[PDB]
Amino acid sequence: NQSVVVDFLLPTGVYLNFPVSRNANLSTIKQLLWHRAQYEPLFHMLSGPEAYVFTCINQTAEQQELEDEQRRLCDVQPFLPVLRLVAREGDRVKKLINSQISLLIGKGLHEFDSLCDPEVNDFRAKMCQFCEEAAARRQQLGWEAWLQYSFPLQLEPSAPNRALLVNVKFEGSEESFTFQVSTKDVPLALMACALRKKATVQPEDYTLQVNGRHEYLYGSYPLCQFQYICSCLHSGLTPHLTMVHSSSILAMRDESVSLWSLEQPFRIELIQGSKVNADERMKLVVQAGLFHGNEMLCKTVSSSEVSVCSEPVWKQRLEFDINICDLPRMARLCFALYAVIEDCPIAWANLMLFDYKDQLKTGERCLYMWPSVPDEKGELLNPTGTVRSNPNTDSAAALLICLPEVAPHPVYYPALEKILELGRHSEEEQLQLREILERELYEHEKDLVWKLRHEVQEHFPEALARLLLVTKWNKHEDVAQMLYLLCSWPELPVLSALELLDFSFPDCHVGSFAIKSLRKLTDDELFQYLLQLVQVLKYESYLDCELTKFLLDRALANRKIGHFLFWHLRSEMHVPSVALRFGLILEAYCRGSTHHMKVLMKQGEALSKLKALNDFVKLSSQKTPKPQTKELMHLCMRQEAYLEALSHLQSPLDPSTLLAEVCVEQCTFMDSKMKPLWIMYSNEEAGSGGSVGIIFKNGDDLRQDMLTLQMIQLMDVLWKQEGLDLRMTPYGCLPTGDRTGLIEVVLRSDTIANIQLDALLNWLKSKNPGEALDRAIEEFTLSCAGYCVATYVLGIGDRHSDNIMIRESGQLFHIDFGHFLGNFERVPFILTYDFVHVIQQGKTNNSEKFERFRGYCERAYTILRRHGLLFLHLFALMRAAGLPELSCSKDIQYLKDSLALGKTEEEALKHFRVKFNEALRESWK
Amino acid sequence: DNIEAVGKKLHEYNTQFQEKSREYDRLYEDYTRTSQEIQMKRTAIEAFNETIKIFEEQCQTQERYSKEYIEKTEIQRIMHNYEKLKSRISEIVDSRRRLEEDLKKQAAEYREIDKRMNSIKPDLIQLRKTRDQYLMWLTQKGVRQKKLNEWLG
Numbered sequence A: 001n002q003s004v005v006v007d008f009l010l011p012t013g014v015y016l017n018f019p020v021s022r023n024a025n026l027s028t029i030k031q032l033l034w035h036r037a038q039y040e041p042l043f044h045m046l047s048g049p050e051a052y053v054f055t056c057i058n059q060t061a062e063q064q065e066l067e068d069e070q071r072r073l074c075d076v077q078p079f080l081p082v083l084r085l086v087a088r089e090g091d092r093v094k095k096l097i098n099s100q101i102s103l104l105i106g107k108g109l110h111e112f113d114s115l116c117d118p119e120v121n122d123f124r125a126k127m128c129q130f131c132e133e134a135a136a137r138r139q140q141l142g143w144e145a146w147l148q149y150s151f152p153l154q155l156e157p158s159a160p161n162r163a164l165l166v167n168v169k170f171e172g173s174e175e176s177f178t179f180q181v182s183t184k185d186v187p188l189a190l191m192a193c194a195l196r197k198k199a200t201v202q203p204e205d206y207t208l209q210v211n212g213r214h215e216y217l218y219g220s221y222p223l224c225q226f227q228y229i230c231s232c233l234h235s236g237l238t239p240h241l242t243m244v245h246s247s248s249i250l251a252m253r254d255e256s257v258s259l260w261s262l263e264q265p266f267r268i269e270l271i272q273g274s275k276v277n278a279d280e281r282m283k284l285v286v287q288a289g290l291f292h293g294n295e296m297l298c299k300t301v302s303s304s305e306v307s308v309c310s311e312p313v314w315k316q317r318l319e320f321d322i323n324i325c326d327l328p329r330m331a332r333l334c335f336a337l338y339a340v341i342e343d344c345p346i347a348w349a350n351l352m353l354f355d356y357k358d359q360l361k362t363g364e365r366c367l368y369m370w371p372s373v374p375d376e377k378g379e380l381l382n383p384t385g386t387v388r389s390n391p392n393t394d395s396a397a398a399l400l401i402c403l404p405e406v407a408p409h410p411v412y413y414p415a416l417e418k419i420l421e422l423g424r425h426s427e428e429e430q431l432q433l434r435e436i437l438e439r440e441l442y443e444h445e446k447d448l449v450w451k452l453r454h455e456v457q458e459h460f461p462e463a464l465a466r467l468l469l470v471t472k473w474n475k476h477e478d479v480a481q482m483l484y485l486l487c488s489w490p491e492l493p494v495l496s497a498l499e500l501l502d503f504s505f506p507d508c509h510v511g512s513f514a515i516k517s518l519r520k521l522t523d524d525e526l527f528q529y530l531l532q533l534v535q536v537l538k539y540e541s542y543l544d545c546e547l548t549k550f551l552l553d554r555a556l557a558n559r560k561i562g563h564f565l566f567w568h569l570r571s572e573m574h575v576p577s578v579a580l581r582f583g584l585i586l587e588a589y590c591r592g593s594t595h596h597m598k599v600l601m602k603q604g605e606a607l608s609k610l611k612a613l614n615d616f617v618k619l620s621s622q623k624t625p626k627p628q629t630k631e632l633m634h635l636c637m638r639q640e641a642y643l644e645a646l647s648h649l650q651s652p653l654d655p656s657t658l659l660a661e662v663c664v665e666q667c668t669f670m671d672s673k674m675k676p677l678w679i680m681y682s683n684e685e686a687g688s689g690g691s692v693g694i695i696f697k698n699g700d701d702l703r704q705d706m707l708t709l710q711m712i713q714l715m716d717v718l719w720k721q722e723g724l725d726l727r728m729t730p731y732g733c734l735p736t737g738d739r740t741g742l743i744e745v746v747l748r749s750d751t752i753a754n755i756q757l758d759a760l761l762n763w764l765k766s767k768n769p770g771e772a773l774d775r776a777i778e779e780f781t782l783s784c785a786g787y788c789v790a791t792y793v794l795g796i797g798d799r800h801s802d803n804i805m806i807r808e809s810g811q812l813f814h815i816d817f818g819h820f821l822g823n824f825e826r827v828p829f830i831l832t833y834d835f836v837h838v839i840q841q842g843k844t845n846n847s848e849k850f851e852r853f854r855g856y857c858e859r860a861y862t863i864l865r866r867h868g869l870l871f872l873h874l875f876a877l878m879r880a881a882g883l884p885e886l887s888c889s890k891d892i893q894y895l896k897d898s899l900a901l902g903k904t905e906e907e908a909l910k911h912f913r914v915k916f917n918e919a920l921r922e923s924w925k
Numbered sequence B: 001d002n003i004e005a006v007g008k009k010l011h012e013y014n015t016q017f018q019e020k021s022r023e024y025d026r027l028y029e030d031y032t033r034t035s036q037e038i039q040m041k042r043t044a045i046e047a048f049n050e051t052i053k054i055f056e057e058q059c060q061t062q063e064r065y066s067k068e069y070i071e072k073t074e075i076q077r078i079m080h081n082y083e084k085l086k087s088r089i090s091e092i093v094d095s096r097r098r099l100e101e102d103l104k105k106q107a108a109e110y111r112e113i114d115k116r117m118n119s120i121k122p123d124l125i126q127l128r129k130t131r132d133q134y135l136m137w138l139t140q141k142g143v144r145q146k147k148l149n150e151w152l153g
């Protein structure tokens, strides 16, 4: 029903309980409160209503001072309908922010306090200060700087001399000025002419905005390198721009025992299990082993068989074949609990032997265990898995161990000082190393590289990864030698650094070298790898790491990176294994991004209403047919709390797009399995793209779809980087939540299934009549090539009329990438007769056109091949994501073969042709 | 021991594996869902703690603010108002108590889901291995990929 009885606690101790409307905003509720309180005792002692602030317990279980009283009670969403009057005074800037953060990131900040963990608290102290300083620095600096922070330039790659017209206007002015400029005019030069026309009917006091978007035209670059202009040129449409004064941007801007002495074999005491749920006839074993990355430091020792029961007791020393001095910094003890007869992995847990301050841990630890999933690998242990405890401490299984007291004083892993102290002291051969490096190594080969490890540094600087693996990390002397080399190792290119971020290289010093080499990344490039970098955080041991700082440095310098950093982290907060890590990064981000918080807040509530809107539609689909369901959607949308929330937000898919006025009539849903929603906005000031759409899908995971699109966008950038525009449609796709995301709609488009009801060729004729049709066919040909190559390389199957889609421009594109890397064997290259028909303009034989198209496909495949190591590296890091079809070396193997990296360039290009040709053959039958 | 006989057994064993996998997958959904619900319950219980703290600070204030005041028929209104306050706390205590009881019941479900998973894992792992042993046996015997495909599923 509409109204709800709310409990009011006045600060005199008096108590009122009356009904108010869920719609009513807080300000309105105060007035009703004050009107009712006047007839209760102690009213004369209350100050005025504006002296006080409502307080509630919100959904995240924390108190919240409700400073914005324009908010509806249904929006505030208190836990129980209970409001306390307290006093305004206090540092309520810190109170407000802290509250909004808890609501925003999903997790309540108190949950971090509750843990009573130094590491957590230390992380929070350092990162929040660091972010806050960055933010305070940003405020002082110039508006130009601020514009660069907030609306970084969106440029076309290569990051041609014709000339066409352009409409420019001023802020708060109906009239506008159409005039000629060239492709190669810089943007300040353009501002000169409109500013001259102003005095008819001061150049650097302004910049240019793209009407109805937060995209801005500035800097030393020519017009045609900007996306909007480039887009306008290709469509033929005139640009539409606004001049905006510095003031207007400023207004936006405002609102002691050395470790190597302990030559004693490593040992732990296994005490008890807890909350174990195993088959009562079987009997329990705990297998345990030390690891450094992938590699066993020693032989894995095991427990005795105790009887299966909920609370099994062992009280067993497990000694290991390694002395305490030999342990490396990132040494990692790993447990697995099994059930055995007289086969079953129950659960596992991992533990860093040293802590975040470099201290060798001592005494009891209670490792709350994770359940084991049965899988292809089925290894003894799971040393790749996270080192954090399971957050379900109440109901999860657990293991009580004890790390013994090893020396009277505490002990740390030696400082960089003494590593260099130890590491200092220590053409026939060159031919063998050449052969081994220049071309999982073997016993024989590993031993050679280690001897010639200095020559590797001198002459094979790119082979650092090869050398790290060949180091014996279970002996401290070796470790000192490698690290010594590492500190004087030359900066490697980005491509090599990405390899080093993989799980195989857990040493803190290696990660530092990696990030050191990624600091040369431009924001445009960093953005291509943001997803991968985020997943790599799941490999980290400690919270405070070079990667977290790096990502925070870039998020704070660039608001677009900050945005996607936010959503990448936010969309996994439901996942227990990363909630804590991610939560802490999100808090730090927010604190240095109060401007963007306001935007991200609005988006999360759009998202929260859409979830509820989809859940209604789903639950109504069962009851009623579609047309009536379509209108019952519209009524729920037209509710003030919904409509306000769904209207006037920056798009999560691209923050420069303003979703302004929702068009309830044009909204709908598809009756597929997950019943996705189609939401249409008509934003003012935009022209041909004065309509924009978003799909809200809930119930499926969208990550594999995004990875695939990210990868296609990357190809498009690699191709565009050598003068080949293949007319792709790299539409936006963003996971925002638990099996929830958004997908950018591509208007003026239909599925081949529908178009086929010269079938394709006529549709294009009716969309490109007369002398247009030539363009549509070329748009089709360029894109067919791109999606033919892309889908062959990524190995995307299950292609059909229902999931290939055509634009009225001619451009073809794929949707709904369910499967890839040849998951339900090698996917052949694929030409449809339908697409060969269109490419040939309807002829049986059009040899001249068809060869251009073969060239396009060959140029495509060649370029990707030049950057094949980039795709392997990016894919290798994505194994962190735990996508079922991207779990192992074989899924990466597919890519090597698909790009034929093991073959020479011309050899590979001959295999492409034979694959190509048999697809041409196979197309008829 | 003949090829058709082993290939028939590879079909059966594959069907038993895919179905056993489907069962575990269904249980693992329940395990995850139950884990999200219980976290939700444990934090709604925190939300009950925090509310009740708010009501007991109110009670503290009602006594301190009233005692110092009440020396100066208003008395009867104040005291009944306090009795009405105290009465509402007992509703909120009762409701908290009901949730605690659900979380206890759902903890027992979580417990049982995880136990049912841990007795399937041996069957599931044994069926993967057997399936694979029959696959390799036939691949060694020279059996063509077409024939292996049609036995699987």
Ligand SMILES: Cc1ccn2nc([C@H](C)Nc3ncnc4[nH]cc(-c5cc(O)cc(NS(C)(=O)=O)c5)c34)n(-c3ccccc3)c(=O)c12
Residues within 6 Å of the ligand: A668, A669, A670, A672, A676, A677, A678, A695, A697, A705, A731, A743, A744, A745, A746, A747, A749, A750, A751, A754, A815, A816, A817
């Ligand atoms: C009402 C409603 C809800 C969802 N959809 N989806 C579609 C079609 C299938 N897809 C699209 N249509 C246009 N622009 C797009 N941009 C991106 C997608 C895209 C990308 C994906 O990876 C997956 C999916 N689909 S999902 C969200 O999983 O259902 C969509 C996409 N159409 C549609 C449009 C034109 C003609 C026929 C059908 C809908 O009417 C519709």
